[PDB]
Design a protein around this ligand. Structure first.
Ligand SMILES: O=C(Nc1cccc(C2=NCCN2)c1)c1ccc(-c2ccc(C(=O)Nc3cccc(C4=NCCN4)c3)cc2)cc1
Ligand SMILES: O=C(Nc1cccc(C2=NCCN2)c1)c1ccc(-c2ccc(C(=O)Nc3cccc(C4=NCCN4)c3)cc2)cc1
Lengths: 330, 330
């Protein structure tokens, strides 16, 4: 039910971002185009990240939430969604993707193409316009600005690392465990899991370095499991349950699965760079019982995350972290 | 001589941006690549914008400049240069350019291609890393963050507007004066002329809304002349004096020259969308005495800028604005 109140707030988000027309009509055409970029690219996902901001926030304070406070929590939720849209529009260009969210990628639209690059940059910019519009008088204004800038930088560094690692031709010597973890941490975990809780945290007046560092320990480990599950499901999931079918192996992805395969292949199995990149790695993954290795790692990972929450949650409510965990773990 | 002290400070800029290796070796390869992006893309221009920050700054205070203060002025100079590099790397992709600064465009490098998009984003991100590293304890920290974010947004809006206006096929009904001015203002004038002085301004403790608004009036008008001269010189300049030869007409640019041509062409001359986009518009421009129209507009524009400085400079030293004007006007 909540997610809907969050999705409701978008037309106001868009309204507010397309107001300058009023004060500066000369730029009207550019603003109309920005509105298209918003509506194409910010809508249509699951909104778990932006929603995480609202749930966290509302779990992290009880009587300090008048209508304006909740409004800011929604806006900063949507800022996370804009950050994500900025990455995705740009990542889709970089990897020559065709579809996104069951839709043609913004850039594959006739009349868009590589103009999508500036479109992506505008999505980014809209983050800091919303923060100024809604949060500039707030004590946590600067903390949120720096948080979104740091998240972007980490993500971009992760993406660099990913591009160096899986060039758009087989090479498996790069696909190591330490490199995999490192890509997941910077490219996915920081912005997907730390950013949304940390922002809620700052908005609740919880600005301590120690507390953020504790929350981060928990959340980066959750992020890591998330992506690994993601990788497992890409291949071994049911498209009837998941809502897409996966192309990791074809794409020369540094998947958890291929990293696991490599540290557990006799040289015969090793090569086999003869089937990585288009059909069945899939058969070899099953020969090495990677589904059982996953099942086992998931059990250990859950144990590990529960101890992490035990050790590192306080003085925050465990529920904030437990909520995420329940979602991650079927 | 100064410009050299500014260019000297780069290897420290790069050193400082590539330090995280020390604390986080897992990301080493990504950092090495970032260092390449810096050195390819931030070096090789004229550095007028970043240099404008140092000259302004040093003209705007007399005994309040110890070694650390001058260091910050240099760093924020270089932040402007990084902003510029971010735009240029990205603009070069969007318009399928071949060369930049007498060099192959970063993205045309074999092994780079559309990865340049993330490279561009990293240049952007490095702005706010330098500001944090050097300026976070300064009273003007937040003002500079917001200034660089606003400059980026304006520029991106300008670029949108430019893309809507000169799609990569002839149409001349879009090439109006009001649209031209509007593109120059947002795409070029804000970040090239207002940003560098305003940052120097903030660093000197001059944070007044009124003063910034006055400085802006002067500087956006300087920006406008700059670009118009740029357009004139593109065609009618001497490549032996300028250091490049111009391709505006071929590229379907909204040049000042074509805007002037259109409001002064009988329908015969009008069409003539038969020669706009590849050889000689050039002959028709001379038939309409556009070089004399330029010469005249330049004389009026100089008059106008001197009155603007007279009226709007105080309480800042006229020299800060006069220095720029002297450079703009042969
Ligand atoms: O509202 C839900 N969770 C929620 C949202 C916001 C905050 C919280 C929360 N709990 C307390 C603290 N915050 C929980 C919720 C509803 C449906 C789901 C649901 C959505 C997608 C899936 C699913 O597709 N999982 C999955 C697997 C692999 C990848 C992804 C995925 N999602 C984003 C990009 N990739 C997602 C599973 C469950 C998840 C969460
Ligand atoms: O150091 C010089 N000017 C300067 C630099 C920084 C601050 C100031 C300044 N005066 C007091 C306040 N700030 C003046 C300087 C040295 C050589 C030049 C020079 C460089 C290029 C040109 C020239 O190519 N002009 C020109 C024409 C059209 C375009 C461009 C251009 N430059 C950046 C992108 N396009 C440049 C003319 C003169 C300009 C300035």
């Amino acid at each position: 039910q909540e997610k809907q109140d969050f999705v409701q707030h978008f037309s106001q988000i868009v309204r507010v971002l397309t107001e300058d027309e009023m004060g500066h009509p000369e730029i009207g055409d550019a603003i109309a185009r920005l509105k298209e970029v918003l509506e194409y690219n910010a809508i249509g996902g699951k909104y778990n990240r932006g929603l995480t901001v609202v749930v966290a926030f509302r779990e992290l304070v009880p009587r300090k939430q008048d209508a304006d406070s909740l409004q800011r929590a929604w806006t900063v939720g949507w800022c996370v969604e804009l950050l994500q849209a900025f990455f995705l529009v740009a990542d889709d260009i970089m990897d020559s993707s065709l579809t996104r969210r069951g839709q043609i990628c913004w850039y594959q639209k006739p009349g868009v193409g590589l103009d999508a690059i500036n479109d992506a940059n505008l999505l980014e910019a809209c983050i800091y316009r919303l923060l100024k519009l809604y949060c500039r008088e707030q004590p946590y204004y600067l903390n949120l600005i720096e948080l979104f800038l740091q998240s972007s930088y980490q993500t971009e560094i992760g993406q660099t690392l990913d591009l160096l690692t899986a060039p758009q031709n087989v090479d498996l010597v790069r696909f190591t465990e330490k490199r995999y973890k490192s890509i997941v941490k910077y490219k996915t975990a920081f912005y997907s899991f730390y950013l949304p809780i940390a922002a809620a945290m700052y908005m609740a007046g919880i600005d301590g370095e120690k507390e953020h560092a504790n929350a981060k320990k928990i959340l980066l480990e959750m992020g890591e499991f998330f992506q690994i599950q993601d990788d497992y499901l890409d291949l071994f999931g049911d498209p009837s349950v998941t809502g897409k079918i996966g192309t990791d192996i074809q794409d020369n992805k540094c998947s958890w699965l291929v990293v696991q395969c490599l540290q557990r292949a006799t040289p015969e199995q090793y090569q086999i760079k003869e089937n990585y990149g288009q059909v069945a790695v899939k058969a070899l993954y099953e020969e090495l019982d990677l589904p059982a290795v996953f099942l086992q790692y998931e059990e250990d990972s859950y144990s590990h995350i529960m101890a992490l929450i035990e050790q590192y949650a306080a003085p925050l409510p465990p529920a904030v972290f437990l909520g995420l965990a329940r979602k991650i773990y079927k």
